[PDB]
Every structure is written in C-alpha cells, then in structure tokens.
Enzyme design. Structure first.
Site, mmCIF file in Angstrom:
data_model
loop_
_atom_site.group_PDB
_atom_site.id
_atom_site.type_symbol
_atom_site.label_atom_id
_atom_site.label_comp_id
_atom_site.label_asym_id
_atom_site.label_seq_id
_atom_site.Cartn_x
_atom_site.Cartn_y
_atom_site.Cartn_z
ATOM 1 N N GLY A 191 2.298 7.575 -0.357
ATOM 2 C CA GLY A 191 1.733 8.366 0.727
ATOM 3 C C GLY A 191 2.671 8.586 1.893
ATOM 4 O O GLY A 191 3.851 8.902 1.706
ATOM 5 N N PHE A 246 3.932 6.524 4.676
ATOM 6 C CA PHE A 246 5.020 5.616 5.032
ATOM 7 C C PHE A 246 5.985 5.282 3.888
ATOM 8 O O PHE A 246 7.093 4.802 4.135
ATOM 9 C CB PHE A 246 4.453 4.337 5.666
ATOM 10 C CG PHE A 246 3.463 4.598 6.773
ATOM 11 C CD1 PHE A 246 2.095 4.450 6.552
ATOM 12 C CD2 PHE A 246 3.896 5.007 8.034
ATOM 13 C CE1 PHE A 246 1.181 4.695 7.567
ATOM 14 C CE2 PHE A 246 2.985 5.254 9.052
ATOM 15 C CZ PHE A 246 1.626 5.097 8.819
ATOM 16 N N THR A 264 6.382 4.321 -0.710
ATOM 17 C CA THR A 264 5.844 4.038 -2.038
ATOM 18 C C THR A 264 5.640 2.528 -2.233
ATOM 19 O O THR A 264 6.513 1.727 -1.865
ATOM 20 C CB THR A 264 6.807 4.607 -3.102
ATOM 21 O OG1 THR A 264 7.123 5.956 -2.761
ATOM 22 C CG2 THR A 264 6.211 4.580 -4.500
ATOM 23 N N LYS A 281 6.695 -2.697 -1.080
ATOM 24 C CA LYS A 281 6.577 -1.457 -0.309
ATOM 25 C C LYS A 281 7.944 -1.043 0.165
ATOM 26 O O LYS A 281 8.590 -1.776 0.902
ATOM 27 C CB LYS A 281 5.634 -1.618 0.915
ATOM 28 C CG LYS A 281 5.346 -0.284 1.644
ATOM 29 C CD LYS A 281 4.440 -0.475 2.878
ATOM 30 C CE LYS A 281 3.158 -1.208 2.557
ATOM 31 N NZ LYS A 281 2.146 -1.003 3.654
ATOM 32 N N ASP A 291 -4.449 -0.380 12.716
ATOM 33 C CA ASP A 291 -4.792 0.528 11.611
ATOM 34 C C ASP A 291 -5.781 -0.064 10.620
ATOM 35 O O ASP A 291 -5.662 0.157 9.405
ATOM 36 C CB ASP A 291 -3.497 1.007 10.885
ATOM 37 C CG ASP A 291 -3.745 2.161 9.903
ATOM 38 O OD1 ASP A 291 -2.897 2.357 9.010
ATOM 39 O OD2 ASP A 291 -4.769 2.883 10.000
HETATM 40 O O1 LIG Z 1 3.252 -2.305 5.895
HETATM 41 C C1 LIG Z 1 2.964 -2.845 6.964
HETATM 42 N N1 LIG Z 1 2.712 -4.186 7.167
HETATM 43 C C2 LIG Z 1 2.509 -5.088 6.126
HETATM 44 C C3 LIG Z 1 1.802 -6.250 6.354
HETATM 45 C C4 LIG Z 1 1.589 -7.169 5.352
HETATM 46 C C5 LIG Z 1 2.098 -6.925 4.093
HETATM 47 C C6 LIG Z 1 2.803 -5.759 3.876
HETATM 48 O O2 LIG Z 1 3.326 -5.488 2.625
HETATM 49 C C7 LIG Z 1 2.461 -4.796 1.797
HETATM 50 C C8 LIG Z 1 1.190 -4.408 2.186
HETATM 51 C C9 LIG Z 1 0.391 -3.748 1.279
HETATM 52 C C10 LIG Z 1 0.861 -3.480 -0.001
HETATM 53 N N2 LIG Z 1 0.083 -2.839 -0.969
HETATM 54 C C11 LIG Z 1 -0.448 -3.712 -1.967
HETATM 55 N N3 LIG Z 1 -0.220 -5.037 -1.894
HETATM 56 C C12 LIG Z 1 -0.728 -5.867 -2.805
HETATM 57 N N4 LIG Z 1 -1.477 -5.561 -3.870
HETATM 58 C C13 LIG Z 1 -1.703 -4.238 -3.956
HETATM 59 C C14 LIG Z 1 -2.448 -3.551 -4.947
HETATM 60 C C15 LIG Z 1 -2.414 -2.214 -4.632
HETATM 61 N N5 LIG Z 1 -1.682 -2.086 -3.483
HETATM 62 C C16 LIG Z 1 -1.433 -0.769 -2.900
HETATM 63 C C17 LIG Z 1 -2.547 -0.337 -1.949
HETATM 64 O O3 LIG Z 1 -2.268 -1.078 -0.770
HETATM 65 C C18 LIG Z 1 -3.167 -0.681 0.256
HETATM 66 C C19 LIG Z 1 -2.506 -1.088 1.539
HETATM 67 O O4 LIG Z 1 -1.436 -0.190 1.765
HETATM 68 C C20 LIG Z 1 -1.225 -3.311 -3.045
HETATM 69 C C21 LIG Z 1 2.139 -3.865 -0.362
HETATM 70 C C22 LIG Z 1 2.938 -4.519 0.541
HETATM 71 CL CL1 LIG Z 1 4.546 -5.043 0.159
HETATM 72 C C23 LIG Z 1 3.028 -4.839 4.871
HETATM 73 N N6 LIG Z 1 2.888 -2.185 8.161
HETATM 74 C C24 LIG Z 1 3.249 -0.788 8.262
HETATM 75 C C25 LIG Z 1 2.758 -0.222 9.582
HETATM 76 C C26 LIG Z 1 3.036 1.266 9.652
HETATM 77 C C27 LIG Z 1 4.510 1.554 9.456
HETATM 78 C C28 LIG Z 1 5.015 0.946 8.168
HETATM 79 C C29 LIG Z 1 4.742 -0.548 8.139
#
Ligand SMILES: O=C(Nc1cccc(Oc2ccc(Nc3ncnc4ccn(CCOCCO)c34)cc2Cl)c1)NC1CCCCC1
Length: 307
Positions: free
Chosen positions: A21, A23, A25, A45, A137
C-alpha cells in the site's frame, strides 16, 4: 543481546508478499540470526521512500522505543535493517489483520470475542500511554490477530518522522495537528465501531474533505445494529469535542472488561451462543501462511525470545 536487533541483509529472507500500500510492502519471511542455527517466522516491512545514512540515528532512536515495548497486546519491533531502504522485522501474526478477519468471519463471531478484542486493544493502548507513545494511526487495519482469542496493536512509532487517515482522526488532530493519548481514544472509538459493524467503512459516501465540517455540526458514526445503547454510548463518548472529557484507556479497560463478563447483555447477535472460530490447526488462513516448503523447521519468536 541488544534490545533493538540490528540485522544484516543476510539474516532475513522475504518468502512471499503479505500486503502492499502507501508506506511500502510487507512480506512473510524468515529471520535466521547468524550462527544461531534457528529459523523464525517473521513479517518484513520494507518502506517505499529512500533513506539517507544521516537520518539513520534519528530512525534508530525512534526504533529503540518501538523495540522496548513489552505487552501481550502490542507487537514488538524485533529488528531493523537500514541500507538504501528501511526494513522492519516483527513476529508473524499468523491470522492477518483484524479488519479483514471480521469481514471474513462475520457469521461466526460472537459477543464474547468482540468484547474481548475491545479489552485487549484498550490494554495495549494503555500500555503505549504508559510509554508516552501516541499511536496516531489506530484503526482495525492496524490491529493483528495472533489467535482468534488474542489481538495485538501494530504500526505505531516513526509516524511523525515518516495519506491522512482523516476518518479515524480526532477533530483536534484534523484542525490543529494535535495528537495526544486522548486523540488516540477517538481513533479507538472508530476502531470499536469498525469491529461492531463487522468491518464497515466509516462515513461511507462522505468525502474526506467534508469530515471536519460534519463533526463540527455534531454528526457521528451511527449505532451498529448489534450494539445496545450502553456500548454505543462508550463509542459516542470517545468522539466528544472536548478531548479531556473522553474516556481514558484505563477506564475503557474497566468498562469493556465488565461487559465481557456478561456479553449477551451488551451485544445482541442472532445465534450468538453457537458461534465458533477456526483454530490454528483448523484454519486455512493459518495453514496458508505456514505450510510453505521454506516454513519447515521453524521456531516461534515468543519462544526464541525467552531470556
Ligand atoms: O510500521 C510502523 N511501525 C511498526 C511498529 C511495530 C512493528 C512494525 O513492523 C511491522 C508492522 C506490521 C507488519 N505487518 C504484519 N506483521 C505481522 N504479521 C502480519 C500478517 C499480515 N501482516 C500485514 C498486515 O499488517 C497490518 C499492519 O500493517 C502482518 C509488519 C511489520 Cl515488519 C512497524 N510505523 C509506520 C508509521 C508510518 C510510517 C511508516 C512506519
């Protein structure tokens, strides 16, 4: 032993795509810490916008706070890799996002589950408030399902440093860019509304540019069909213009926990008593994330991280 683990590109591999989306993949993959001979299922991420080595210390400082969070209802940042891009690593939540989950399982979700999720999200949000970390958020799309019994908040931090979710935002955040724990309470109310409508889109058909004027006129999200007026009034209170008059997460934990002891009193769901959600062993969402060939001899992150 570092609280924020600094991972080399060689210490993780992206296996498949999970989502994509604004921010960047998210991938499902494996964390293979060097020389430790263990494989850990993780999500990865990778952020779309390029990074410079200058901002790296600012990102690392922000990332340290995210790595410090230790609560069963909050996802912990497990590691980070800074190169041309920012990659974040976290524990794979093997049931996906809660917004999708409730849309998918709307026919087997009872009042007990809904209310328990409300409790868990408020507990996680209260923990962030103890860590003086405004989420900015919160939404059902940013809650993950660890098991049908247990959800966790994600996607907090790095927000002020790195599209505007207008329909989840408190009026003061829209008008004056004020974000506090009380603005998070407003987003919590919209989140609960999303859960109670089994994943409806808030203010459907109203353009984001008109939201501030509709809120000023006193309009709010309507009562979900399943909600008694006790539960709806909690939501309504989260959206009061006076941020100091909104519930605090600590108070929300208490109220929803009370409701969770007698769930059918507070939500009216036809066929409620007979509703069951598929276990990790009985789930095809779960078995699709995990029955890959590369997901073979793995160790769960919560297990590996026993100190
Ligand atoms: O990113 C953060 N902070 C932040 C904070 C903590 C952790 C963190 O790492 C992750 C977060 C979400 C995910 N995703 C998933 N994780 C786990 N199991 C699943 C299953 C499907 N998914 C996908 C669906 O996920 C829904 C949530 O997106 C998953 C992956 C990671 Cl690595 C980032 N802040 C942003 C603020 C705005 C600017 C950019 C940074």
């Amino acid at each position: 032993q570092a609280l924020l683990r600094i991972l080399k590109e060689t210490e993780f591999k992206k296996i498949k795509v999970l989502g994509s989306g604004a921010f960047g993949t998210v991938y499902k993959g494996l964390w293979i810490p060097e020389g430790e001979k263990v494989k850990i299922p993780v999500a990865i991420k990778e952020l779309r916008e390029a990074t410079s080595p200058k901002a790296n210390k600012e990102i690392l400082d922000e990332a340290y706070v995210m790595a410090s969070v230790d609560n069963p209802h909050v996802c912990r940042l497990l590691g980070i890799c800074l190169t041309s891009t920012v990659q974040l690593i976290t524990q794979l939540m093997p049931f996906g996002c809660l917004l999708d989950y409730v849309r998918e399982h709307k026919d087997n979700i009872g009042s007990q589950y809904l209310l328990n999720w409300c409790v868990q999200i408020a507990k996680g949000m209260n923990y962030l408030e103890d860590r003086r970390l405004v989420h900015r958020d919160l939404a059902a799309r940013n809650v993950l399902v660890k098991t049908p019994q247990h959800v966790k908040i994600t996607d907090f931090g790095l927000a002020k440093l790195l599209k505007v979710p207008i329909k989840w935002m408190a009026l003061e955040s829209i008008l004056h860019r004020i974000y506090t724990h009380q603005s998070d309470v407003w987003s919590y109310g919209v989140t609960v509304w999303e859960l109670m409508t089994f994943g409806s889109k808030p203010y459907d058909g109203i353009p984001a540019s008109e939201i501030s004027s509709i809120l000023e006129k006193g309009e709010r999200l309507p009562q979900p069909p399943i909600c008694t007026i006790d539960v709806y009034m909690i939501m309504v209170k989260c959206w009061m213009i006076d941020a100091d008059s909104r519930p605090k997460f600590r108070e929300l934990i208490i109220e929803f926990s009370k409701m969770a002891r007698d769930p059918q009193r507070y939500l009216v769901i036809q066929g409620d008593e007979r509703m069951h959600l598929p276990s990790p062993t009985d789930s095809n969402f779960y078995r699709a994330l995990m029955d890959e060939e590369d997901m073979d001899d793995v160790v769960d992150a919560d297990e590996y991280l026993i100190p």
